[PDB]
């Protein structure tokens, strides 16, 4: 297990235009493309993204570059977050993808913004942090895949990806 499949499993793989839990026009593995009701809008920002007329389909290979590159987004933003980089540098291996599978889903300032579980995951208080994590709109909403984030960052092994 590592950070592509987690991800994978998380956010399945679609190669049309699909509507994400929030509504909003995604592609891929989890790739948004816009938070705007309009499908041109979304179709306008697939071509732009993939550099060819679309019509809103892609190939698996596109798909998987579209990953690549959302995963070493998400890793740059962490390490470039002042509130973010020290609870990164401070984990071990594990729940490094834990939190990148975080920002991810929800960006940078999401994440940045849950204060208290980050002090608790730098003070490896994990069943604390756990606790924490949970009292979040994140968790009420998608919950199985909150769940098994949560257990990753409680248990520092993939059991949950298992
Ligand atoms: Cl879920
Ligand atoms: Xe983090
Ligand atoms: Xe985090
Ligand atoms: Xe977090």
Not at 93 to 105: H, L
């Amino acid at each position: 297990m590592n950070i592509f499949e987690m991800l994978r499993i998380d956010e399945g793989l679609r190669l049309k235009i699909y509507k994400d839990t929030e509504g909003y026009y995604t592609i891929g593995i989890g790739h948004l493309l816009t938070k705007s009701p309009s499908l041109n809008a979304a179709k306008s920002e697939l071509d732009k993204a993939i550099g060819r007329n679309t019509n809103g389909v892609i190939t698996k290979d596109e798909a998987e570059k579209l990953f690549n590159q959302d995963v070493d987004a998400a890793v740059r933003g962490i390490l470039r977050n002042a509130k973010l980089k020290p609870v990164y540098d401070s984990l071990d291996a594990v729940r490094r993808a834990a939190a990148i599978n975080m920002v991810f889903q929800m960006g940078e300032t999401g994440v940045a913004g849950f204060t208290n579980s980050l002090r608790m995951l730098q003070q490896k208080r994990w069943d604390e942090a756990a606790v924490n994590l949970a009292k979040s709109r994140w968790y009420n909403q998608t919950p199985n895949r909150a769940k098994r984030v949560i257990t990753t960052f409680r248990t520092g092994t993939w059991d949950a990806y298992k």
